[PDB]
Amino acid sequence: LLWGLVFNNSVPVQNPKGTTSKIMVSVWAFFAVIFLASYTANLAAFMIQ
Amino acid sequence: EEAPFVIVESVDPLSGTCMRNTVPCQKRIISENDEEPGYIKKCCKGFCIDILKKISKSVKFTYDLYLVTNGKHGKKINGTWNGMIGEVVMKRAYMAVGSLTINEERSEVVDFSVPFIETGISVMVSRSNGTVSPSAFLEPFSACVWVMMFVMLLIVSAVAVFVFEYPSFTIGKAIWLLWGLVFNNSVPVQNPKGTTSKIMVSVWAFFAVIFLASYTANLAAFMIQEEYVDQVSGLSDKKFQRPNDFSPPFRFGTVPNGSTERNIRNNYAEMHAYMGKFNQRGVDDALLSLKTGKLDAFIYDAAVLNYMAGRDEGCKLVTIGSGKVFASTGYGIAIQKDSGWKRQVDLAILQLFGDGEMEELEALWLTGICHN
Amino acid sequence: QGLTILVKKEIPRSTLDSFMQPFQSTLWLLVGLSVHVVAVMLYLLDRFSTLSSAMWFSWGVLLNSGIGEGAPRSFSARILGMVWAGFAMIIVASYTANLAAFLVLDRPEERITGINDPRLRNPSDKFIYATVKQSSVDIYFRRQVELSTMYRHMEKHNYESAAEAIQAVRDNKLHAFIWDSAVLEFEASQKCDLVTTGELFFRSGFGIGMRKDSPWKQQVSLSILKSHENGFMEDLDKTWVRYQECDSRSNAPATLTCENMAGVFMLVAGGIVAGIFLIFIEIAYK
Amino acid sequence: AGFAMIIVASYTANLAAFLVLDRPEERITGINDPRLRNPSDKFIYATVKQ
Amino acid sequence: EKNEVMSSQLDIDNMAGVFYMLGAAMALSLITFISEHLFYWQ
Ligand SMILES: N[C@@H](Cc1cc(-c2ccc(Cl)cc2Cl)cc(CP(=O)(O)O)c1O)C(=O)O
Ligand SMILES: *[C@@H]1O[C@H](CO)[C@@H](O)[C@H](O)[C@H]1NC(C)=O
Ligand SMILES: *[C@@H]1O[C@H](CO)[C@@H](O)[C@H](O)[C@H]1NC(C)=O
């Protein structure tokens, strides 16, 4: 799961058991979205040569 | 010897006088002395010196130079003339050069050649740090694409349910899925049934991914916006007869005790009073404390701003464009009344313009490099 | 006043050739084959310590959809699918990067900046402009020790009256134009299809003249000077010249539009056709 | 959901803007550069005395 | 003395690295399946 999240998305699983695992994976996914965004930007930096 | 038109510098001791393409100028000084004044002041160069030297070299007459000892651009002092022009009513000299304006009270006695450098009461503004649009997030796409999107949604949902009739997926679940997919993602929901109908949502997803990508790409342009220069017409502007339409911080820069003042206290006087607390000591404090929001709009004679612009390290100091100025006059040359040189210097200075040289001269002194 | 320039200016329409523009026609098919390659490699990888299912899983993640039920139940197939997904991220990411870098860079050509501008520094025939005949302009262009190279280039296309030039350039026949300031300044602020470079070009100034030594000169000369302290001419300005307003409003990168995104919209028709085929073909296969 | 997409996208775009124009001032282009034609006190430039 | 341009897909050769890593992962997958067919031995 957590690998399938930094890179965009796939493979349906939930791990939904006790809502606290939920509040845990939440911050992870947050960090993921900001990471992906930063990457897209600073790579669009290099395609201008 | 006031402006960067008429500079004087210390006499060069290493090779006699000045050693470089200038003319000397003397200074006979006696004050609170019986004795005789006089001594070689200095070598004496500058823009006005340049035009004088060339024009004399071309109209074949010779001259010399000593400075004014008592006065300035003189005015009427008990119905008389002191200083510069006073040195010409007394016939103690023949002509007057240097930064000098033209009005009636001076056009009475001395006479004035055709002016060369323009001048007038102008304004000084400063740029603004960026203007990101308020309705940016709906700019980078035309009006078509959105309703086109909506109707494509509808038709795809229709063909979906109808190729499906060959818990139960219907209009609601399908449209909800499709919306939630074309936008990045959301809300795990039921899928369509049947292996074959899956093709449709697939190609739709392709459409959507390329869509979102293109959209963020385009919108990544409307955050790069150029420097925004303010706009204002001549001093007949709504923004200054009624300056409280916005905050009082909109301060106005005009140094007192001079031609700006006198040419102001004659027509409105209301800007004059409203500028009461907004007085400023000269050009130094003005063009320093203007950059930092304490001084915002300015009032002065353009023939100094159009110079001081191209010296400041920054670039946020630009006047408004030409053809929007107040006191259309020009610096010139002053001669004794009805002499026999008005005609000749006139023809020769118009010649100077016609042959394209004053541009070179202004390039040497007047305008700097800091073109905007 | 002085001299200025005049040229048409408008919102550009910098546009992509097609949604597929930022790729070459080859790689588009390279990925299309490689996806099935790695799919069937999964299919022959997991089966030994689900065909259409693994097909779907494999071909979905390149679409970030939600479709897909199966998954790898081995270990090696897992260690493959991870990098497969990473590749799926990189593809679309690079796509976004490239399209962006394209649409930020392509800001259209500069305006004609002035006399020293490169884009007109030499006389040129792919970029044609005119001037005013029998006027002060070719008078000042007579004595051009240096400028003679463009002097001839103009005098081979000179024009007669303004109504020629303005109406022509509005019709995009010519590229550039020259005159004294006031005329074109007004003509710009009146109708807002044209602008100026604002660059001053050669000082001058109008005035009044009479045959020599006529007894008027002094009176009119003092009158005019009287007519610039009381600001009567300041009023005349607003009476005739600084008359209208069209905002500067530096143009934008020209939103994509209804124009070419229909390259994508070409996809829904292919979807419909393939569907009405595949329904009958499914009836048969069933 | 649409609002979510808009906020995330705008975030990406703004960051893309701020990185592209993160490059220092141009090398001194010669003897006629602004930053050297008229002096300043930020970065100084001289030679050896005499 | 300088300008900038935007390419088209920028290459196939510049993109080759991704396929390099793709093939490398495929090879590791194969060798790991083999090592699993081995380590069922335990
Ligand atoms: N032009 C007037 C005198 C005069 C001169 C200047 C001036 C100041 C600095 C520099 Cl560097 C150059 C100049 Cl020309 C400014 C004003 C403006 P103010 O009225 O606020 O004193 C003025 O009156 C004359 O010749 O009768
Ligand atoms: C404008 O932006 C520059 C960028 O460095 C900054 O230094 C300056 O303080 C800003 N000024 C204002 C008024 O926003
Ligand atoms: C300027 O003039 C005002 C009023 O005319 C006077 O109060 C002030 O002292 C003057 N300042 C100077 C420096 O002459």
CSV table of C-alpha atoms in Angstrom, one decimal, chain D residues 10-46:
chain,number,residue,atom,x,y,z
D,10,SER,CA,-2.6,25.9,-8.0
D,11,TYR,CA,-0.1,24.8,-5.4
D,12,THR,CA,1.8,22.9,-8.0
D,13,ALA,CA,1.7,25.7,-10.5
D,14,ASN,CA,2.9,28.3,-8.1
D,15,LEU,CA,5.8,26.2,-7.1
D,16,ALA,CA,6.6,25.6,-10.7
D,17,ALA,CA,6.7,29.4,-11.2
D,18,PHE,CA,9.0,30.1,-8.2
D,19,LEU,CA,11.5,27.5,-9.3
D,20,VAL,CA,11.9,28.4,-12.9
D,21,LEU,CA,13.0,32.0,-12.2
D,22,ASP,CA,15.3,30.9,-9.4
D,23,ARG,CA,18.6,31.6,-11.2
D,24,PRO,CA,21.1,34.2,-10.2
D,25,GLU,CA,21.8,37.5,-12.0
D,26,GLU,CA,23.5,37.2,-15.4
D,27,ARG,CA,27.3,37.2,-15.6
D,28,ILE,CA,28.8,40.6,-16.2
D,29,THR,CA,28.2,40.9,-19.9
D,30,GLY,CA,31.2,43.1,-20.5
D,31,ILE,CA,32.2,46.7,-20.0
D,32,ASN,CA,28.7,48.1,-20.5
D,33,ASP,CA,26.6,46.2,-18.0
D,34,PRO,CA,24.2,48.2,-15.8
D,35,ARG,CA,25.6,46.7,-12.6
D,36,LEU,CA,29.0,48.0,-13.6
D,37,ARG,CA,28.4,51.1,-15.7
D,38,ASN,CA,27.1,53.1,-12.8
D,39,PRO,CA,28.8,52.0,-9.5
D,40,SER,CA,27.1,50.5,-6.5
D,41,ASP,CA,28.1,49.2,-3.1
D,42,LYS,CA,26.8,45.7,-3.3
D,43,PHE,CA,29.6,44.0,-5.3
D,44,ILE,CA,32.8,46.0,-5.9
D,45,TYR,CA,35.2,45.6,-8.8
D,46,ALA,CA,38.7,47.1,-9.2
